[PDB]
Amino acid sequence: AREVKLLLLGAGESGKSTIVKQMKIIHEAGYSEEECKQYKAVVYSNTIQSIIAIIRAMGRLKIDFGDSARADDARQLFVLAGAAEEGFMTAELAGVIKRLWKDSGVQACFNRSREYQLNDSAAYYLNDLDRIAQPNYIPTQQDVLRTRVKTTGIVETHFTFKDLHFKMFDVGGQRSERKKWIHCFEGVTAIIFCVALSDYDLVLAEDEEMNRMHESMKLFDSICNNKWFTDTSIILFLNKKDLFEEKIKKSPLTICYPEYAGSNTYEEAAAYIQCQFEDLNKRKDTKEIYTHFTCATDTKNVQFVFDAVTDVIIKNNLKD
């Protein structure tokens, strides 16, 4: 059997579900126009959810609206919140969102997203409001990629590429159906650990004993060094590099690593993080890590990175 088992791991919001969808676009035949239609309701809901999250955050952070006229829209949003659930973004609704998203109070809060929890499909959807507001609208494949869906168990995708049968599991965060879950961790060719680089500047939340980056690290530390994984490739996806590059211009990496004596260039910071992770590997003679810098929402990039990952797998099983 030329069969390859790939397990995706990493904190929530690290890009795992996206990598899965992306395999479908790249190596299966994508999403058919019918399937795209099915995500219409999802796109609408996420857009609604995203703006609500910003609005609610305004209260907590105590940020006043740019124009106090928008207060009505805030109240109106909650009334209309369900207006799209099976159908259409009525015009009224588009108006509310459009006007809120434009407001400077909202925006100042959107800038301060490190201070709360704003999903990374927010900007994407809200800036394309005009396009998705159309009654005739059919979600593009880039739109389907950007959808945020609750799953309640193991996510799987399979494809054939370069004469190899690929099985990929995003095991997710649900223990229910426990034997099949544990099995995802068994007979794995390669583990692909995802990291959201852009988490580096997130405020230490009231429910955490260390920042998100160190949480990710601790996780990687235990995966990498687990004796069950001795003969499993460890592949590291330092993801969300697009957002990381923008943030690092303004927020110092010392926010995340106080001891960091380097500089706030994308290049130098990214290299520092990679080292922070790779240094966690405690069996360096018997194991190397395969680091990749990705933007998971970018098909072309994933295609290239995954192609590379495959080539290593091929060159690997030529120990026969």
Partner: peptide, 21 residues
Amino acid sequence: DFFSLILRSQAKRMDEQRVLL
């Protein structure tokens, strides 16, 4: 514990900003 740590970690998404299918 190895499996716990993973479970708890990957569960921490933003579920008020996702949706059922």
